[PDB]
Motif scaffolding. Structure first.
Motif, PDB file in Angstrom:
ATOM      1  N   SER C 243      44.493 -32.659 -19.144  1.00 37.45           N
ATOM      2  CA  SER C 243      45.798 -32.722 -19.995  1.00 37.45           C
ATOM      3  C   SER C 243      46.801 -33.080 -18.820  1.00 37.45           C
ATOM      4  CB  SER C 243      46.161 -31.047 -20.462  1.00 37.45           C
ATOM      5  OG  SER C 243      45.156 -30.873 -21.159  1.00 37.45           O
ATOM      6  N   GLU C 244      46.839 -32.782 -17.370  1.00 36.43           N
ATOM      7  CA  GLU C 244      47.988 -33.296 -16.568  1.00 36.43           C
ATOM      8  C   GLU C 244      47.672 -34.547 -16.112  1.00 36.43           C
ATOM      9  OE1 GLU C 244      47.767 -30.485 -13.001  1.00 36.43           O
ATOM     10  OE2 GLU C 244      48.628 -32.277 -11.817  1.00 36.43           O
ATOM     11  N   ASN C 245      46.544 -35.183 -16.339  1.00 40.42           N
ATOM     12  CA  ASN C 245      46.189 -36.309 -15.778  1.00 40.42           C
ATOM     13  C   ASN C 245      45.992 -37.547 -16.835  1.00 40.42           C
ATOM     14  OD1 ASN C 245      45.114 -34.785 -13.264  1.00 40.42           O
ATOM     15  ND2 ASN C 245      45.724 -36.555 -12.582  1.00 40.42           N
ATOM     16  N   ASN C 246      46.605 -37.208 -18.042  1.00 36.67           N
ATOM     17  CA  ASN C 246      46.606 -37.892 -19.267  1.00 36.67           C
ATOM     18  C   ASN C 246      45.233 -38.372 -19.770  1.00 36.67           C
ATOM     19  OD1 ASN C 246      49.196 -37.454 -19.082  1.00 36.67           O
ATOM     20  ND2 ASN C 246      49.703 -39.339 -18.055  1.00 36.67           N
ATOM     21  N   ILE C 247      44.061 -37.863 -19.706  1.00 35.15           N
ATOM     22  CA  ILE C 247      42.653 -38.305 -19.804  1.00 35.15           C
ATOM     23  C   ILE C 247      42.436 -37.861 -21.171  1.00 35.15           C
ATOM     24  CG2 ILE C 247      40.135 -38.488 -19.037  1.00 35.15           C
ATOM     25  CD1 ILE C 247      42.006 -38.728 -16.410  1.00 35.15           C
ATOM     26  N   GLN C 248      41.743 -38.651 -22.193  1.00 33.71           N
ATOM     27  CA  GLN C 248      41.075 -38.265 -23.353  1.00 33.71           C
ATOM     28  C   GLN C 248      39.726 -38.696 -23.417  1.00 33.71           C
ATOM     29  OE1 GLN C 248      44.667 -39.951 -26.357  1.00 33.71           O
ATOM     30  NE2 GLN C 248      44.534 -40.746 -24.590  1.00 33.71           N
ATOM     31  N   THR C 249      39.050 -37.513 -23.698  1.00 31.73           N
ATOM     32  CA  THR C 249      37.613 -37.503 -23.314  1.00 31.73           C
ATOM     33  C   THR C 249      36.653 -37.569 -24.741  1.00 31.73           C
ATOM     34  OG1 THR C 249      37.923 -35.924 -21.554  1.00 31.73           O
ATOM     35  CG2 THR C 249      35.648 -36.301 -22.224  1.00 31.73           C
ATOM     36  N   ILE C 250      35.836 -38.664 -24.654  1.00 32.00           N
ATOM     37  CA  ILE C 250      34.690 -38.870 -25.691  1.00 32.00           C
ATOM     38  C   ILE C 250      33.607 -38.245 -25.401  1.00 32.00           C
ATOM     39  CG2 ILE C 250      33.485 -40.852 -27.178  1.00 32.00           C
ATOM     40  CD1 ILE C 250      36.386 -42.189 -26.536  1.00 32.00           C
ATOM     41  N   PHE C 251      32.805 -37.516 -25.960  1.00 29.68           N
ATOM     42  CA  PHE C 251      31.738 -36.897 -25.545  1.00 29.68           C
ATOM     43  C   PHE C 251      30.708 -37.551 -26.446  1.00 29.68           C
ATOM     44  CE2 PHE C 251      34.560 -33.188 -25.034  1.00 29.68           C
ATOM     45  CZ  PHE C 251      34.583 -32.919 -23.665  1.00 29.68           C
ATOM     46  N   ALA C 252      29.977 -38.558 -25.774  1.00 35.69           N
ATOM     47  CA  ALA C 252      28.871 -39.249 -26.355  1.00 35.69           C
ATOM     48  C   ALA C 252      27.512 -38.823 -26.257  1.00 35.69           C
ATOM     49  CB  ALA C 252      29.135 -40.793 -26.130  1.00 35.69           C
ATOM     50  N   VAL C 253      27.140 -37.782 -27.050  1.00 39.84           N
ATOM     51  CA  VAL C 253      26.133 -37.074 -26.889  1.00 39.84           C
ATOM     52  C   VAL C 253      25.090 -36.909 -28.142  1.00 39.84           C
ATOM     53  CG1 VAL C 253      27.549 -35.629 -25.265  1.00 39.84           C
ATOM     54  CG2 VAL C 253      27.329 -34.702 -27.540  1.00 39.84           C
ATOM     55  N   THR C 254      23.817 -36.682 -27.440  1.00 40.62           N
ATOM     56  CA  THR C 254      22.681 -36.885 -28.458  1.00 40.62           C
ATOM     57  C   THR C 254      22.699 -35.774 -29.654  1.00 40.62           C
ATOM     58  OG1 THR C 254      21.061 -35.570 -27.151  1.00 40.62           O
ATOM     59  CG2 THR C 254      21.288 -38.107 -26.929  1.00 40.62           C
ATOM     60  N   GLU C 255      22.061 -36.036 -30.887  1.00 38.58           N
ATOM     61  CA  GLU C 255      21.917 -35.258 -32.006  1.00 38.58           C
ATOM     62  C   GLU C 255      21.310 -33.627 -31.645  1.00 38.58           C
ATOM     63  OE1 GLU C 255      19.299 -37.373 -30.931  1.00 38.58           O
ATOM     64  OE2 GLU C 255      17.825 -35.703 -30.988  1.00 38.58           O
ATOM     65  N   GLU C 256      20.846 -33.192 -30.550  1.00 34.91           N
ATOM     66  CA  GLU C 256      20.450 -31.935 -30.400  1.00 34.91           C
ATOM     67  C   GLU C 256      21.444 -30.884 -29.826  1.00 34.91           C
ATOM     68  OE1 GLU C 256      16.905 -31.881 -27.542  1.00 34.91           O
ATOM     69  OE2 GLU C 256      16.828 -29.668 -27.630  1.00 34.91           O
ATOM     70  N   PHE C 257      22.500 -31.664 -29.013  1.00 37.38           N
ATOM     71  CA  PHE C 257      23.358 -30.878 -28.352  1.00 37.38           C
ATOM     72  C   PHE C 257      24.901 -31.133 -29.035  1.00 37.38           C
ATOM     73  CE2 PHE C 257      20.002 -31.254 -25.291  1.00 37.38           C
ATOM     74  CZ  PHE C 257      19.953 -30.059 -24.924  1.00 37.38           C
ATOM     75  N   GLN C 258      25.007 -31.573 -30.127  1.00 37.64           N
ATOM     76  CA  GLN C 258      26.062 -31.485 -31.232  1.00 37.64           C
ATOM     77  C   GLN C 258      26.714 -30.048 -31.017  1.00 37.64           C
ATOM     78  OE1 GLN C 258      27.905 -34.362 -32.498  1.00 37.64           O
ATOM     79  NE2 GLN C 258      26.712 -35.361 -30.975  1.00 37.64           N
ATOM     80  N   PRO C 259      26.044 -29.007 -31.320  1.00 37.22           N
ATOM     81  CA  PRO C 259      26.634 -27.798 -31.543  1.00 37.22           C
ATOM     82  C   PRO C 259      27.435 -27.177 -30.336  1.00 37.22           C
ATOM     83  CG  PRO C 259      24.459 -27.480 -31.799  1.00 37.22           C
ATOM     84  CD  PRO C 259      24.590 -28.862 -31.701  1.00 37.22           C
ATOM     85  N   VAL C 260      26.969 -27.400 -29.049  1.00 38.51           N
ATOM     86  CA  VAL C 260      27.839 -27.142 -27.879  1.00 38.51           C
ATOM     87  C   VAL C 260      29.071 -27.869 -27.754  1.00 38.51           C
ATOM     88  CG1 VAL C 260      26.094 -25.828 -26.641  1.00 38.51           C
ATOM     89  CG2 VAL C 260      26.017 -27.993 -26.282  1.00 38.51           C
ATOM     90  N   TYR C 261      28.933 -29.176 -27.775  1.00 35.92           N
ATOM     91  CA  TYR C 261      29.938 -30.291 -27.463  1.00 35.92           C
ATOM     92  C   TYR C 261      30.794 -30.370 -28.740  1.00 35.92           C
ATOM     93  CZ  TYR C 261      27.758 -31.728 -23.306  1.00 35.92           C
ATOM     94  OH  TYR C 261      26.942 -31.902 -22.124  1.00 35.92           O
ATOM     95  N   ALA C 272      37.175 -35.719 -28.406  1.00 41.80           N
ATOM     96  CA  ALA C 272      36.288 -36.273 -29.483  1.00 41.80           C
ATOM     97  C   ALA C 272      34.798 -36.177 -29.158  1.00 41.80           C
ATOM     98  CB  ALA C 272      36.744 -37.415 -29.994  1.00 41.80           C
ATOM     99  N   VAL C 273      33.950 -36.001 -30.138  1.00 40.66           N
ATOM    100  CA  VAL C 273      32.196 -36.027 -29.959  1.00 40.66           C
ATOM    101  C   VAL C 273      31.788 -37.218 -30.897  1.00 40.66           C
ATOM    102  CG1 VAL C 273      30.545 -34.672 -30.018  1.00 40.66           C
ATOM    103  CG2 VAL C 273      32.509 -33.335 -29.450  1.00 40.66           C
ATOM    104  N   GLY C 274      30.863 -37.875 -30.499  1.00 43.72           N
ATOM    105  CA  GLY C 274      29.824 -38.649 -31.341  1.00 43.72           C
ATOM    106  C   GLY C 274      28.340 -38.297 -31.187  1.00 43.72           C
ATOM    107  N   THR C 275      27.755 -38.687 -32.083  1.00 45.46           N
ATOM    108  CA  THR C 275      26.220 -38.506 -32.176  1.00 45.46           C
ATOM    109  C   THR C 275      25.598 -39.918 -31.514  1.00 45.46           C
ATOM    110  OG1 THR C 275      25.966 -37.078 -33.966  1.00 45.46           O
ATOM    111  CG2 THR C 275      24.028 -38.105 -33.363  1.00 45.46           C
ATOM    112  N   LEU C 276      25.286 -39.741 -30.218  1.00 44.12           N
ATOM    113  CA  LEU C 276      24.676 -40.848 -29.387  1.00 44.12           C
ATOM    114  C   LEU C 276      23.282 -40.960 -29.946  1.00 44.12           C
ATOM    115  CD1 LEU C 276      25.290 -42.665 -26.796  1.00 44.12           C
ATOM    116  CD2 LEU C 276      24.265 -40.864 -25.609  1.00 44.12           C
ATOM    117  N   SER C 277      22.772 -42.371 -30.160  1.00 43.22           N
ATOM    118  CA  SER C 277      21.526 -42.831 -30.351  1.00 43.22           C
ATOM    119  C   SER C 277      20.603 -42.264 -29.451  1.00 43.22           C
ATOM    120  CB  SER C 277      21.452 -44.142 -30.760  1.00 43.22           C
ATOM    121  OG  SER C 277      20.077 -44.701 -30.757  1.00 43.22           O
ATOM    122  N   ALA C 278      19.461 -41.995 -29.304  1.00 36.80           N
ATOM    123  CA  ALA C 278      18.450 -41.732 -28.415  1.00 36.80           C
ATOM    124  C   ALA C 278      18.384 -42.859 -27.308  1.00 36.80           C
ATOM    125  CB  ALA C 278      16.843 -41.666 -28.738  1.00 36.80           C
TER     126      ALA C 278
END
Ligand SMILES: *[C@@H]1O[C@H](CO)[C@@H](O[C@@H]2O[C@H](CO)[C@@H](O[C@@H]3O[C@H](CO[C@H]4O[C@H](CO[C@H]5O[C@H](CO)[C@@H](O)[C@H](O)[C@@H]5O)[C@@H](O)[C@H](O[C@H]5O[C@H](CO)[C@@H](O)[C@H](O)[C@@H]5O)[C@@H]4O)[C@@H](O)[C@H](O[C@H]4O[C@H](CO)[C@@H](O)[C@H](O)[C@@H]4O)[C@@H]3O)[C@H](O)[C@H]2NC(C)=O)[C@H](O)[C@H]1NC(C)=O
Ligand SMILES: *[C@@H]1O[C@H](CO)[C@@H](O[C@@H]2O[C@H](CO)[C@@H](O[C@@H]3O[C@H](CO)[C@@H](O)[C@H](O[C@H]4O[C@H](CO)[C@@H](O)[C@H](O)[C@@H]4O)[C@@H]3O)[C@H](O)[C@H]2NC(C)=O)[C@H](O)[C@H]1NC(C)=O
Ligand SMILES: *[C@@H]1O[C@H](CO)[C@@H](O[C@@H]2O[C@H](CO)[C@@H](O[C@@H]3O[C@H](CO)[C@@H](O)[C@H](O)[C@@H]3O)[C@H](O)[C@H]2NC(C)=O)[C@H](O)[C@H]1NC(C)=O
Ligand SMILES: *[C@@H]1O[C@H](CO)[C@@H](O[C@@H]2O[C@H](CO)[C@@H](O[C@@H]3O[C@H](CO)[C@@H](O)[C@H](O)[C@@H]3O)[C@H](O)[C@H]2NC(C)=O)[C@H](O)[C@H]1NC(C)=O
Ligand SMILES: *[C@@H]1O[C@H](CO)[C@@H](O[C@@H]2O[C@H](CO)[C@@H](O[C@@H]3O[C@H](CO)[C@@H](O)[C@H](O)[C@@H]3O)[C@H](O)[C@H]2NC(C)=O)[C@H](O)[C@H]1NC(C)=O
Ligand SMILES: *[C@@H]1O[C@H](CO)[C@@H](O[C@@H]2O[C@H](CO)[C@@H](O[C@@H]3O[C@H](CO)[C@@H](O)[C@H](O)[C@@H]3O)[C@H](O)[C@H]2NC(C)=O)[C@H](O)[C@H]1NC(C)=O
Ligand SMILES: *[C@@H]1O[C@H](CO)[C@@H](O[C@@H]2O[C@H](CO)[C@@H](O)[C@H](O)[C@H]2NC(C)=O)[C@H](O)[C@H]1NC(C)=O
Ligand SMILES: *[C@@H]1O[C@H](CO)[C@@H](O[C@@H]2O[C@H](CO)[C@@H](O)[C@H](O)[C@H]2NC(C)=O)[C@H](O)[C@H]1NC(C)=O
Ligand SMILES: *[C@@H]1O[C@H](CO)[C@@H](O[C@@H]2O[C@H](CO)[C@@H](O)[C@H](O)[C@H]2NC(C)=O)[C@H](O)[C@H]1NC(C)=O
Ligand SMILES: *[C@@H]1O[C@H](CO)[C@@H](O[C@@H]2O[C@H](CO)[C@@H](O)[C@H](O)[C@H]2NC(C)=O)[C@H](O)[C@H]1NC(C)=O
Ligand SMILES: *[C@@H]1O[C@H](CO)[C@@H](O)[C@H](O)[C@H]1NC(C)=O
Ligand SMILES: [Ca+2]
Ligand SMILES: [Ca+2]
Ligand SMILES: [Ca+2]
Ligand SMILES: [Ca+2]
Ligand SMILES: [Ca+2]
Ligand SMILES: [Ca+2]
Ligand SMILES: [Ca+2]
Lengths: 533, 112, 377, 120
Positions: C243-261, C272-278
């Protein structure tokens, strides 16, 4: 209030040793009473071992409070039988260098358990570097010392017990049963792992590094959905089942999709009785656990620390301010939701990294609790907060705040990162507290002062009446009428004392004689120190 | 003291499975046991396996991998997956305890 | 009470053409840049600010990638982002720059198998893994897209012991290293690409690591040195430093780990979070869908208030939808060139020892601010 | 390799005494606990007794069928173990096996036991 905070006794170990990482009372009683201090990074007189760790015995009642290291182990790292039989030359089976011995210290009666959770070994079959745990158990005042390494087994890699780190946490129950946590078993599911000192002694076969403690209790492996949970990151003991045998509380700080949970396992079996779960994801719920009767109902109440917990300010900015959750036990059971929660006030302070019972510190009828914040205070050296017992549970605001008397420096002190309380060192009839501070290589001993209860009244004359638990026969008081000022000795066993000649105001005399133990009495809460007509 | 209970006989057709059982005393239901195979004509016993309360086992150095073990409270099992002629033997259960060792009464495994 | 709007330079008109494209300092999106408020005891003081999403504000993208062995086929598909993503972003902005860095784990005894063999090759002998590392800054942000393809195409995969990976002390270094990563005063996008959970503070204790993360840059020769010395950050320290360094994070993570991210997203603001292809084959559209989600929302932060002062927000958004309370900091569905209003109420309960102090109200993800100056009556 | 070899099996009258010997080879005999196990001529195994190493003070153990009648002894310089049997019963007819405990309390090595024939 009751702990003597203006001149506590300070113990110091070697520089850069982490002295004060774990602390304890030894032989609490009329004689032999001592403090034990762990130093995980200390150097040791062992052939070829670098920073193997140490444990220091610091005898009480010696005015310079000197400390000497205990040799639980005195050998180097053991060698592979095939290698010492071979033209290729010798190689170690063990890696005792940098093992962190003394990172856990516990005592019960004349027995002491000291553990090295970063010990590791080459399995005798194939080249591996498996961080199994080890502990050394001393029995009958150093008459015998036994290596206990319950995760060192034929199930040797990260998929079995090879990464177990047993003795990362430990306890003794009221009967003297050893209880260990190892957070790394079965791909970091973790394990609780318990044996009696009689079983540990009957098991002794020193020629075998893989060995059986026949009758040992341990929790089973679960499905791979439970991996990376860290069961046994912390352990405590209390009676929660309603039987005669204490039940193991254990922390699972990464379990439950990283929300964390705490589990109470029954004694006699090792089956689960209750589960509590964390309020917020990756708040470290189960970093610390404790069990003591804080409301005096006769039943152990659970306490759990979550040092990384976030909230946001009334302004709206978020902050890391840890939380402690309290769960009173009722005769029907333990409620699945907190009866009270205590939150820290310093950002990154980590309130709830440490919990200890104090026993009944002020002899009020109710067990008090000390809670640590290793990075709290106005210059981030660390803090300890005393919370009072009472019929509703703990008070929501502390009765005392303990802080370093020494100045800040180039690296953290971690003051309040280790606590031990609820035994009595000087024998004055009030509990005492040990605080660890390993970033400066120190430990600090705080002593409960005698408490005086008092009363007085105007009778236009005035009269005075005072008494107190374990206090001397004559109590020194000083008195002001508002003028006339007087200093009086009032007998602890008296009915009343009285004088012939507005407000009457009194205090314990600040320059009265110091007691046999080196302390002065504290005047109790309430007790009406001023009266006005 | 520790009592180990075994049934006197078990049987299966060549190529079918067999399960032996050994039951511990209820005071000792969490104890770890060894399994021995010992029926071969007047020859000394042979260590097959040891088996833990939780079902974890480790096999002897030469054992054919047809053998596997499992546990259920006080019960301990040896499973042979597809009986060969060379599996026809007495199998003895055994348990170490504070002041000695005890063996089960043995089970004969028979082809039919 | 009284108020006076001092600067009030207008938000940008919708840009007429290519003939004079503006610098990111000349583009204005928030209306009053400074005002002074006279507060009086318990009297509430209200002011309003307008926001307007600019047409073509530049982008910096840092791609941060897990190089554990299960990402080997992902790395084979990721070789081409330095031309394919440069092309698909050319409709989104005139100015875009891309960078690459890679992570595995802390290089210490619980998290890596430490035998001489597993230090040389972390994997099975038929898998040619390089030795483990905590973080590499492979390529500081550039417009030369073919240099991303060149350098990313010659990286080699590594390996690790425990399942969750040491990505959080790689996120910390990307945030706090500033001019080494090469960040401008533009929209800073961090893509965090992985197929596992995260290690966080207190996990260092198993390795004997007990010092908290200080949140400072420790890169030497583009490697993160001192991963063995400082613990992983907590989420509460990443919330601060992102937040201090103005950075916006895209968690591009696989279908298994969606419920933590999907819950790390609820804690870390403007992420933001996306479902990464294997095999990361959907990466370019994942980044663009996530950017449209990040860019079409405003959240108002404020600097720390002095004692007895209080603040509250109301928000007025597109299609007549509004908000109040802490939800009054948000606004949504903000299209390109579209406009928004906030009304903000200051209050006091004291007369402080100094006649004035000041604080900034600012959109998360931007350097543009309104300064509010308080005069106590 | 790793042999155990029993000797001294014989035919003897009841009330007599007998000395059984066992020799080890191919392993460090002074680093293992050694043990005696009998098997009567059509019956299951019975543990007779055993004898620990120097760090365990050469402590020794016996079954209640055997206590006070038999005695076990060791010579780590000869790699050899002994059983002295006194006041023999007809119940003492068996093959006597010599064997070793591992740390996990299983008998890894066995000899090929001596017949003792206590008979009138
Ligand atoms: C507090 O919270 C914790 C959770 O945080 C909670 O604990 C979990 O509770 C659940 C429910 O009790 C547990 O799940 C069950 O686990 C049972 C045991 O699983 C292991 O053992 C199974 C049986 O075989 C072993 O034991 C038998 C004993 O009879 C013995 O013969 C065998 O030889 C062997 O030793 C085994 O089947 C099971 O298999 C799983 O795991 C193995 C790896 O070990 C894997 O290879 C398998 O593929 C499989 O995933 C495992 O080995 C299990 O029996 C039980 O089964 C039920 O569910 C299945 C469907 O999932 C049904 O088909 C079946 O009929 C049963 O209904 C179930 O899986 C879980 O393990 C606990 N987690 C822990 C301990 O971390 C506590 O209860 C809470 N306490 C409270 C609420 O107070
Ligand atoms: C339980 O075990 C502990 C640990 O060993 C033991 O504490 C130690 O006891 C010994 C014996 O009293 C102490 O040794 C003393 O050390 C001081 C210097 O530090 C010496 O001045 C003492 O001298 C006396 O004893 C000598 C014996 O050789 C005499 O020759 C001499 O004239 C004096 O009489 C003495 O050597 C040791 O300091 C403590 N250690 C600590 C840190 O407590 C404890 O006593 C045991 N308790 C039992 C057996 O119940
Ligand atoms: C345990 O013993 C070891 C080894 O003696 C101690 O490590 C030693 O620490 C010293 C003092 O810092 C080191 O010397 C210093 O070296 C640096 C350059 O590296 C230099 O700037 C200083 O002038 C200085 O002499 C030394 O290298 C180091 N040696 C080893 C083998 O690591 C350690 O401190 C001891 N730990 C405890 C708990 O007592
Ligand atoms: C914590 O563990 C102990 C030990 O298992 C639990 O106590 C156990 O409770 C069971 C059920 O009552 C007892 O079984 C008993 O069987 C006998 C007949 O064999 C019967 O007569 C008894 O009435 C009872 O049913 C078991 O003996 C008992 N074990 C011990 C050591 O007392 C206890 O229940 C567990 N914790 C709780 C309270 O959940
Ligand atoms: C990355 O993953 C994607 C998605 O899993 C893969 O996409 C797939 O590519 C294969 C080619 O190897 C396609 O297979 C072909 O399909 C046609 C039509 O059905 C058929 O006639 C061919 O014989 C062949 O089977 C497949 O349809 C396509 N989709 C999926 C999900 O399989 C992609 O190949 C992976 N690799 C890379 C480097 O992108
Ligand atoms: C949410 O907030 C907005 C902004 O305060 C509210 O907009 C308000 O809408 C009313 C009704 O349209 C406006 O009154 C009339 O507006 C029309 C133009 O829309 C104008 O021609 C009339 O002369 C009259 O002014 C009001 O001015 C407008 N306020 C602002 C500042 O935009 C909206 O009503 C609120 N809706 C909710 C969720 O209650
Ligand atoms: C693990 O933690 C999650 C989150 O706290 C738990 O989900 C919660 O369940 C309780 C009881 O139903 C609700 O009151 C909370 O609102 C839920 N929170 C969320 C985020 O959904 C979950 O039940 C916990 N699991 C365990 C270990 O009991
Ligand atoms: C009785 O009351 C008087 C008035 O408070 C006390 O005298 C003062 O106490 C305060 C607080 O301890 C000190 O700071 C002052 O220096 C004291 N002097 C005065 C008169 O102002 C007195 O200590 C009280 N004593 C007793 C016996 O209770
Ligand atoms: C694993 O990959 C590395 C890098 O390609 C290989 O090392 C290179 O091998 C080639 C061909 O011999 C040389 O031209 C490079 O100079 C080498 N570079 C390095 C990393 O030193 C390595 O040989 C490969 N190993 C396996 C298992 O194939
Ligand atoms: C991005 O914005 C920040 C904050 O406005 C700039 O940092 C300031 O730069 C000026 C001029 O060098 C200094 O006087 C301030 O002290 C700086 N403040 C901070 C926040 O450090 C930064 O220079 C801008 N950079 C770009 C790319 O325009
Ligand atoms: C934005 O507005 C459109 C209508 O113009 C609507 O369809 C869409 O759902 C809105 N998006 C949100 C909810 O932000
Ligand atoms: Ca109990
Ligand atoms: Ca209670
Ligand atoms: Ca109290
Ligand atoms: Ca005391
Ligand atoms: Ca992975
Ligand atoms: Ca992949
Ligand atoms: Ca990892």
């Amino acid at each position: 209030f009751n702990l003597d905070a203006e001149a506590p006794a300070v113990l110091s170990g070697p520089p850069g040793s982490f002295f004060g990482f774990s602390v304890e009372f030894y032989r609490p009683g009329t004689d032999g009473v001592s403090v034990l201090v762990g130093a995980p990074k200390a150097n040791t007189s062992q052939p070829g071992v670098l920073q193997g760790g140490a444990v220091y015995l610091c005898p009480w009642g010696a005015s310079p409070t000197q400390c000497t290291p205990i040799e639980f182990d005195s050998k180097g790292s053991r060698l592979l039988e095939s290698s010492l039989s071979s033209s290729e030359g010798e190689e170690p089976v063990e890696y005792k260098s940098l093992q962190w011995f003394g990172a856990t210290v516990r005592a019960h009666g004349s027995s002491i358990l000291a553990c090295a959770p970063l010990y590791s070994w080459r399995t005798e079959k194939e080249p591996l570097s498996d961080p199994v745990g080890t502990c050394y158990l001393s029995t009958d005042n150093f008459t015998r010392i036994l290596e206990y390494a319950p995760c060192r087994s034929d199930f040797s890699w990260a998929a079995g017990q090879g990464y177990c780190q047993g003795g990362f946490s430990a306890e003794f129950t009221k009967t003297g049963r050893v209880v260990l946590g190892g957070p790394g078993s079965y791909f970091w599911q973790g394990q609780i792992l318990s044996a009696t000192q009689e079983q540990i002694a009957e098991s002794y076969y020193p020629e075998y590094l893989i060995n059986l403690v026949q009758g040992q209790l341990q929790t089973r492996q679960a499905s791979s959905i439970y991996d990376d949970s860290y069961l046994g990151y912390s352990v405590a003991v209390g009676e929660f089942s309603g039987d005669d045998t204490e039940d193991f509380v254990a922390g699972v700080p990464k379990g439950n999709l990283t929300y964390g949970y705490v589990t109470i396992l029954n004694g006699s079996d090792i089956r689960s009785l209750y589960n509590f779960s964390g309020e917020q994801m990756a708040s470290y719920f189960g970093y610390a656990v404790a069990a003591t009767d804080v409301n005096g109902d006769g039943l152990d109440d659970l306490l759990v620390g979550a040092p990384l917990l976030m909230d946001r300010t009334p302004d709206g900015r978020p902050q890391e301010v840890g939380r402690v959750y309290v769960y009173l036990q009722h005769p029907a059971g333990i409620e699945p939701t907190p009866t009270l929660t205590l939150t820290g006030h310093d950002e990154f302070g980590r309130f709830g990294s440490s919990l200890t019972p104090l026993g009944d510190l002020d002899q009020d009828g109710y067990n008090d609790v000390a809670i640590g914040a290793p990075f709290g205070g106005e210059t981030q050296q660390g803090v300890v907060f005393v919370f009072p017992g009472g019929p509703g549970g703990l008070g929501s605001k502390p009765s005392q705040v303990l802080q370093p008397l020494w100045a800040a420096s180039h690296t953290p002190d971690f003051f309040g990162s280790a606590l031990r309380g609820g035994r009595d060192l000087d024998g004055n009839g009030y509990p005492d507290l040990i605080v660890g501070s390993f970033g400066v290589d120190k430990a600090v001993v705080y002593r409960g002062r005698p408490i005086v209860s008092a009363s007085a009244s105007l009778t236009i004359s005035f009269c005075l009446n005072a008494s107190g638990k374990h206090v001397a026969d004559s109590i020194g008081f000083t008195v002001e009428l508002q003028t006339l000022t007087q200093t009086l000795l009032i007998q602890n066993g008296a009915r009343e004392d009285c004088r012939e000649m507005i407000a009457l105001n009194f205090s314990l005399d600040p320059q009265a004689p110091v007691d046999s133990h080196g302390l002065r009495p504290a005047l109790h809460y309430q007790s009406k120190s001023r009266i006005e007509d | 003291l520790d009592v180990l209970t075994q049934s006197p006989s078990a049987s299966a057709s060549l190529g079918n499975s067999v399960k032996l059982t050994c039951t511990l005393s209820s005071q000792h239901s969490t104890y770890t046991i060894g399994w021995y195979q010992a029926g071969h004509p007047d020859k000394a016993p042979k260590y097959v396996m040891y088996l833990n309360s939780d079902g974890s086992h480790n096999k002897g150095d030469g054992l054919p991998d047809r053998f596997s073990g499992s546990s259920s409270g006080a019960h301990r099992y040896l499973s042979i997956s597809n009986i060969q002629p060379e599996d026809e033997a007495d199998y003895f259960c055994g348990s170490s305890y504070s002041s000695g060792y005890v063996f089960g009464s043995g089970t004969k495994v028979e082809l039919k | 009470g009284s108020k006076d709007i001092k600067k009030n330079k207008n938000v940008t008109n919708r840009s007429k053409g290519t003939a004079e494209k503006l610098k990111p300092e000349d583009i204005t999106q928030i209306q009053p840049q400074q005002l002074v408020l006279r507060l009086r005891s318990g009297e509430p003081q209200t002011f309003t600010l307008k926001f307007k999403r600019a047409e073509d504000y530049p982008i910096d993208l840092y791609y941060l990638m897990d190089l554990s062995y299960s990402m080997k086929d992902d790395l084979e598909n990721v070789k081409s982002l330095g031309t394919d993503l440069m092309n698909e972003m050319r409709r989104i902005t005139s100015d875009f720059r891309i960078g690459f860095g890679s992570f595995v784990e802390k290089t210490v005894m619980p998290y890596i198998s430490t035998t001489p063999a597993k230090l040389r090759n972390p994997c099975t002998s038929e898998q040619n893994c390089t030795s483990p590392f905590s973080y590499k800054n492979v390529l500081s942000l550039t417009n030369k897209g073919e240099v991303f393809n060149e350098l990313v195409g010659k990286q080699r995969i590594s390996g690790n012991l425990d399942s969750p990976e040491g990505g959080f002390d790689a996120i910390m270094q990307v945030a706090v290293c500033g001019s080494l990563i090469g960040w401008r005063n533009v929209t800073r996008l961090l893509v965090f690409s992985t197929d596992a959970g995260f290690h966080f503070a207190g996990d260092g204790k198993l390795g004997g690591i007990v010092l908290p993360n200080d949140g400072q840059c420790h890169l030497e020769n583009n490697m993160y040195t001192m991963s063995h010395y400082y613990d992983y950050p907590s989420i509460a320290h990443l919330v601060q430093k992102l937040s201090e360094n103005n950075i916006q994070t895209i968690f591009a993570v696989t279908e298994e780990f969606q419920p933590v991210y999907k819950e790390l997203k609820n804690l870390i603001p403007k992420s933001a979070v996306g479902t990464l292809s294997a095999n990361s084959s959907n990466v370019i559209q994942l980044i663009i869908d996530a950017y449209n989600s990040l860019s079409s929302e405003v959240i108002l932060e404020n600097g720390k208030l002095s004692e007895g002062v209080t603040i509250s927000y109301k928000s007025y958004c597109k299609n007549g939808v509004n908000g109040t309370g802490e939800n009054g900091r948000k606004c949504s569905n903000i299209s390109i060139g579209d406009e928004v209003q906030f009304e903000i109420s200051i209050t006091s309960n004291k007369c402080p020892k100094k006649d004035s102090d000041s604080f900034k109200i600012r959109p998360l993800g931007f350097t543009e601010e309104v300064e509010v100056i308080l005069q106590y009556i | 390799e790793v042999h155990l070899v029993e000797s001294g099996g014989d035919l003897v009258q009841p009330g007599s005494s007998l000395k059984l010997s066992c020799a080890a080879s191919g392993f460090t005999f002074s680093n293992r606990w050694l043990y005696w196990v009998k098997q009567a001529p059509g019956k299951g195994l019975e543990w007779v007794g055993g004898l620990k190493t120097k760090p365990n003070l050469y402590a020794t153990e016996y079954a209640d069928s055997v206590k006070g009648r038999f005695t076990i002894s060791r010579d780590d310089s000869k790699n050899s173990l002994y059983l002295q049997m006194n006041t023999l019963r007809v119940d003492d007819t068996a093959l006597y096996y010599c064997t070793s405990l591992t740390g996990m309390r299983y008998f890894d090595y066995w000899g090929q036991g001596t017949m003792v024939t206590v008979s009138s």
